[PDB]
Subunit: 229 residues, 3 copies
């Protein structure tokens, strides 16, 4: 019952969720427009567009109650967060000699499952899946830190630096998510610490996404342009 907890009484988080949704939409447009002017491949503009627009659309379930609303987080991250890791995977490939799409799939597949464990954690009211999720996230991080790093180092010195920058960014932001999820004291969530109240929890999982999507998109695409100079 995440939704009722988030929107009962004040629903203080709604200004933030509204602002997220709008900055998402306008960012999505800008992302489509950018790579025309920017000298980065279109696939990046496109991917970030979907990251941000999919996220936006899902968060509308907090403004308007549907059957989705209690799980709108996992509906969003389901497809947003693998697209993020795809953006990050393809950047690494960009200049490089050997592309490795089996690793892309692993990268993306882990994220998806990771996010489904959250889904499962909450629905079950049980933390067991959450632990499996965290192990997977470590697996993602490993994947980013090593194999994809190496592939990125095959290419130009600028791009490899760009990857490292993006990867550590995305790495560390990702690790925050299971944190605020665990320490949330929303009754539904089986996190056994209770530090953040529903509105706080909700607001964290608006600001955090903002950095991981809206900023990420620009960060990714400016960094690839600025490398290829």
């Amino acid at each position: 019952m995440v939704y009722e907890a988030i929107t009962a009484g004040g629903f203080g988080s709604q200004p933030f969720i509204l602002a997220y949704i709008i900055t998402a939409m306008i960012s999505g447009l800008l992302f489509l427009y950018l790579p025309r002017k920017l000298d980065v491949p279109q696939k990046f503009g496109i991917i970030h567009f979907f990251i941000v627009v999919w996220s936006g659309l899902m968060y509308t379930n907090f403004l308007n109650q549907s059957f989705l609303s209690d799980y709108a987080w996992y509906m969003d991250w389901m497809v947003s967060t693998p697209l993020i890791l795809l953006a990050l995977g393809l950047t690494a490939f960009h200049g490089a000699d050997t592309k490795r799409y089996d690793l892309l799939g692993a990268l993306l597949g882990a994220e998806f499952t990771l996010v489904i464990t959250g889904l499962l954690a909450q629905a079950q009211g049980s933390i067991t899946p959450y632990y499996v999720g965290v192990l997977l996230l470590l697996g993602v991080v490993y994947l980013l830190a090593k194999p994809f790093r190496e592939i990125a180092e095959e290419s130009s010195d600028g791009l490899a630096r760009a990857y490292k920058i993006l990867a550590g960014y995305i790495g560390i932001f990702f690790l925050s998510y299971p944190t605020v999820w665990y320490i949330s004291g929303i009754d539904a969530l089986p996190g056994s610490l209770n530090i953040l109240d529903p509105t706080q929890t909700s607001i964290a999982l608006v600001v955090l996404p903002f950095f991981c999507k809206q900023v990420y998109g620009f960060l990714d695409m400016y960094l690839i342009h600025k490398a290829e100079l």
Copy 2:
């Protein structure tokens, strides 16, 4: 309460829906068969097979109530309408030199998001997401209309003509759905106009699909066949 409305009173749409399903299943079997007879790549038979068989299976939720029924259309279009666009895209690729698979993804991705907006709108009884869906639709027809057209025009004249025909056929039909959705007077479906009664909506929503899937299946495969015969 889309299902509830649709099966209200007589349930007038009942037998149309049944004929759509039966018909889908038979189309499917042909689609698997045709390519071998037709000198068209098997991949095309396979895509149309799933399109027409997926749709048919989802529509059985109007004949037997389930937790899916209210959102059946979306459960269908979710995977059917990107497959439709995959065929169209792959047709454009068929005889061309440069293949843009990131554009294929954008094409297919937009459709999926664009059907999910439809689902969101009904689920929150809210019209907002629909507008984004409409914006995405226009991105789809733009994609089809230009980049994919460009790629199509590297190929022989017949294959370019084929794409151009199918691209208009599916583009025009595709714009009808958000129309009759908005137009519909089922209450679950938001938007102000209530022009179409639930049975009229339902019947619009098996007629258009019959043209987008069954007819489209054959049309695609015959245009690709006629173009390759014309150029050999």
Copy 3:
């Protein structure tokens, strides 16, 4: 009412469901490591990792009631069993000249659709969709038995033998599922027959998946390995 029936009273399947999840997680870790030890392509490890881990996860919904619980088998096979087939397909492709990724798509799509029929059947309380599934599954067996077999025979004798063994293994086992599903006396799923009680059904759908996931991942990677050893 699937969860309630299974877990009601003694919940006699809970140990098997536990033993299954624990072995799945452990098998998964091993699958990731095995490829580097066997000179088998890492991708096979990846795919088998996800098969057991995803399956394991979905089965936690029998240990803890959720909205997914009643439909957990479908949520599992919905992605697990296309992956099982991806592995089969890629095995066949492994030594071969022609990679036909449309057959891979057809293989995977039939499976996924074929699981969704099971979910529709339960959700509808109707046996109709089950029947489409069975057809579809005979589509799958067909694919495996022929075109995929031909592509395997393109390769070395060791690789070709590997595929045919696995294809047999997995074919036979895949047929058992629509059988147990049908004869199961869980009220929710609409077989005419009521031979198994929920616990027996549950046990069967623990032990059979053990052989199709945990065992199969090892079997697949060792057969390839062996095969690659046999030809310098």
